[PDB]
Scaffold this active site. Structure first.
Site, PDB file in Angstrom:
ATOM      1  N   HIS A 108      22.239  50.365  67.081  1.00 21.52           N
ATOM      2  CA  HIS A 108      23.002  50.628  65.864  1.00 21.52           C
ATOM      3  C   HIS A 108      22.945  52.125  65.482  1.00 21.52           C
ATOM      4  O   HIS A 108      22.822  52.497  64.298  1.00 21.52           O
ATOM      5  CB  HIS A 108      22.521  49.716  64.705  1.00 21.52           C
ATOM      6  CG  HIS A 108      22.957  48.291  64.853  1.00 21.52           C
ATOM      7  ND1 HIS A 108      24.190  47.849  64.422  1.00 21.52           N
ATOM      8  CD2 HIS A 108      22.351  47.221  65.426  1.00 21.52           C
ATOM      9  CE1 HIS A 108      24.317  46.559  64.693  1.00 21.52           C
ATOM     10  NE2 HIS A 108      23.214  46.152  65.305  1.00 21.52           N
ATOM     11  N   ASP A 137      17.045  45.849  65.452  1.00 19.62           N
ATOM     12  CA  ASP A 137      17.897  44.705  65.771  1.00 19.62           C
ATOM     13  C   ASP A 137      18.933  45.028  66.856  1.00 19.62           C
ATOM     14  O   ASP A 137      19.399  46.160  66.957  1.00 19.62           O
ATOM     15  CB  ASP A 137      18.648  44.254  64.508  1.00 19.62           C
ATOM     16  CG  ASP A 137      19.523  45.372  63.896  1.00 19.62           C
ATOM     17  OD1 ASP A 137      19.017  46.500  63.693  1.00 19.62           O
ATOM     18  OD2 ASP A 137      20.715  45.124  63.597  1.00 19.62           O
ATOM     19  N   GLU A 138      19.325  44.015  67.630  1.00 19.72           N
ATOM     20  CA  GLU A 138      20.496  44.112  68.530  1.00 19.72           C
ATOM     21  C   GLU A 138      20.532  45.373  69.401  1.00 19.72           C
ATOM     22  O   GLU A 138      21.559  46.054  69.491  1.00 19.72           O
ATOM     23  CB  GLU A 138      21.779  43.991  67.703  1.00 19.72           C
ATOM     24  CG  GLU A 138      21.862  42.620  66.985  1.00 19.72           C
ATOM     25  CD  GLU A 138      23.077  42.450  66.088  1.00 19.72           C
ATOM     26  OE1 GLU A 138      23.668  43.450  65.614  1.00 19.72           O
ATOM     27  OE2 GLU A 138      23.447  41.272  65.845  1.00 19.72           O
ATOM     28  N   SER A 139      19.409  45.680  70.026  1.00 19.58           N
ATOM     29  CA  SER A 139      19.312  46.825  70.947  1.00 19.58           C
ATOM     30  C   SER A 139      19.711  46.358  72.354  1.00 19.58           C
ATOM     31  O   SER A 139      18.930  46.484  73.306  1.00 19.58           O
ATOM     32  CB  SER A 139      17.872  47.366  70.948  1.00 19.58           C
ATOM     33  OG  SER A 139      17.548  47.837  69.644  1.00 19.58           O
ATOM     34  N   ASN A 140      20.941  45.852  72.481  1.00 17.28           N
ATOM     35  CA  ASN A 140      21.375  45.163  73.695  1.00 17.28           C
ATOM     36  C   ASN A 140      21.681  46.131  74.841  1.00 17.28           C
ATOM     37  O   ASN A 140      21.884  45.715  75.991  1.00 17.28           O
ATOM     38  CB  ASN A 140      22.579  44.254  73.403  1.00 17.28           C
ATOM     39  CG  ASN A 140      22.288  43.202  72.325  1.00 17.28           C
ATOM     40  OD1 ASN A 140      21.149  42.751  72.137  1.00 17.28           O
ATOM     41  ND2 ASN A 140      23.327  42.801  71.623  1.00 17.28           N
TER      42      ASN A 140
END
Ligand SMILES: CC1=N[C@@H]2[C@@H](O)[C@H](O)[C@@H](CO)O[C@@H]2S1
Length: 504
Positions: free
Chosen positions: A260, A323-326
């Site tokens: 993000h 969060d959401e460190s894809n």
């Protein structure tokens, strides 16, 4: 015995008589009433002069609220000899069992007396006091034709959870300092005591960092959908913190990392492997952005940001997201989050992070997990490490549509109406943990105006606020729903553009 769940109200939403929300530990009413008249003063008395001085400031805030709707000019007096018709705020002889935020609030015919352990508790109790006066008291302009009465009554109160928070996303769409102050103020009236600011994401960077000026010059210049964006100077951030502090609200700033991060990556090419700035993003996709986990420039950048933010943020906590460190490998995520936790700790700050950040080998038992996923395996690491947990389940995701047909909101956690926002317990999210408390999260992909915020937070936040304050044994939807109907005029009076939820 026969039982049922709630359906929608036939014929549409329903949206002397106090309406206390959250529900207090005990509330009894006796015969008689107190009348607030133009001659009333607020008397304050603490255990020493310094405490009396703090109570004096609290009294002045109360007087200002009361004066706005009554048209009176109630003044505040440092004295332990209140006169007939007075409101009296004191910390002398507080019941220690009620803690920092607890209070007794006793109204007789001649006097209102609020007795607490700490100034903080008198502030929380004052939120109750405002709810004992007639609807009309919460107006911001003078109300005529209403006798300002309080029933003879006895309240004792204290919170179930220590952390009762609201997060506002100011990255996806930007909100002014005034707009932010107003949401803090409204939340404070329902005993929310924590405000988490999501200050950075893919679509914008909202905090002035003097050592990296292009975060603002480039990174603040947009938002979701491509409006002009905006940002807070360091002085404006301090102003927000100070405003929150007057309401005994801790401000926890978030700089989300390593995911993000597009806005930072669009500001400084050196943060990217190819040395080029990313294009700014105005869509709503998530998961694709990453800082370089093995480049020293990354950690220099993070340390400069943390240094400047720590200097202006008195909270012992900084939220580093996670969060959401894809686009970050599990190995690199572990390493990265451990390194940035060490940087934060060197600047005297403890780290909060979204799951799965608790799994970092660099976390300490002073780190805090914000558990949003709320699955069986989430926070296994946090529990083993003795880390406090803040819960944010689907029920606290206030950016979710109320219903399939809501004109704004998301729905990746399903719909969250006022009932769903009430009918849960923090232990539903995680079992066997040290639950620090609850946080309502208002993401802003689809919210652009103040009216959009009001519509989604009210009445949903009221439900979450009761879950944080009121003990589970005392929570009951049928009770709360009827109290909420009674409270509705007060929402109207405050100028809140709430949704009239047909389940209420
Ligand atoms: C933690 C989370 N990270 C994501 C956010 O970036 C979105 O804005 C939000 C919208 O509901 O969904 C998940 S929650």
């Amino acid at each position: 015995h026969h039982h049922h769940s709630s359906g929608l109200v036939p014929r549409g939403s329903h949206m002397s008589q106090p309406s206390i929300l959250p529900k207090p530990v005990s509330y009894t009413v006796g015969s008689g009433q107190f009348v607030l008249t133009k001659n009333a003063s607020i008397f304050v008395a603490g255990n020493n002069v310094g405490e009396t001085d703090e109570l004096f400031n609290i009294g002045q805030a109360l007087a200002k609220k009361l004066n706005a709707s009554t048209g009176y000019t109630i003044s505040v007096v440092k004295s332990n000899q209140p006169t007939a018709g007075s409101i009296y705020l004191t910390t002398v002889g507080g019941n220690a069992a009620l803690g920092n935020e607890g209070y007794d609030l006793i109204t007789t015919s001649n006097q209102v007396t609020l007795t607490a352990n700490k100034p903080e508790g008198v502030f929380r109790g004052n939120q109750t006091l405002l709810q004992l006066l007639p609807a009309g008291i919460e107006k911001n302009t003078v109300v005529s034709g209403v006798q300002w009465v309080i029933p003879h009554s006895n309240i004792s109160d204290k919170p179930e959870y220590e952390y009762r928070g609201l997060m506002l996303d100011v990255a996806r769409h930007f909100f002014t300092v005034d707009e932010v102050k107003r949401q803090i103020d409204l939340a404070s009236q329902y005993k929310i005591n924590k405000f988490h600011m999501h200050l950075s994401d893919d679509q914008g960077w909202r905090i002035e960092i003097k050592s990296w000026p292009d975060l603002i010059e480039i990174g603040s210049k947009g938002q979701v959908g491509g409006g002009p964006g905006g940002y807070y100077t360091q002085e404006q951030f301090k102003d927000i913190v100070s405003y929150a502090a007057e309401r005994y609200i801790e401000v926890i700033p978030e700089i989300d990392m390593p995911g993000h991060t597009n806005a930072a990556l669009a500001s400084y090419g050196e943060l990217n492997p190819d040395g080029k700035r990313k294009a700014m993003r105005t869509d709503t996709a998530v998961g694709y952005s990453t800082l370089m986990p093995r480049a020293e420039i990354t950690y220099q950048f993070v340390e400069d940001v943390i240094s400047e933010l720590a200097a202006i943020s008195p909270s012992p906590y900084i939220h580093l997201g996670g969060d959401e460190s894809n686009a970050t490998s599990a190995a690199d995520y572990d390493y990265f989050f451990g390194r940035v936790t060490a940087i934060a700790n060197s600047y005297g700050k403890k780290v909060v992070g979204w799951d799965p950040s608790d799994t970092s080998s660099g976390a300490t038992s002073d780190s805090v997990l914000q558990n949003w996923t709320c699955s069986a395996s989430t926070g296994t690491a946090a529990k083993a490490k003795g880390m406090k947990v803040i819960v944010s389940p689907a029920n606290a995701y206030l950016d979710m549509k109320y219903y399939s047909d809501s004109p704004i909101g998301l729905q990746w956690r399903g719909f969250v109406n006022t009932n769903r926002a009430y009918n849960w317990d923090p232990t539903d999210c995680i079992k066997g943990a040290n639950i620090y408390g609850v946080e309502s999260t208002l993401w802003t992909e689809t919210f652009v105006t103040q009216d959009h915020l009001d519509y989604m937070l009210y009445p949903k936040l009221l439900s979450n606020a009761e879950v944080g304050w009121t003990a589970r044994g005392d929570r009951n939807w049928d009770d709360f729903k009827e109290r909420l109907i009674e409270h509705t005029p007060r929402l109207q009076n405050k100028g809140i553009k709430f949704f009239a939820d047909p389940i209420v």
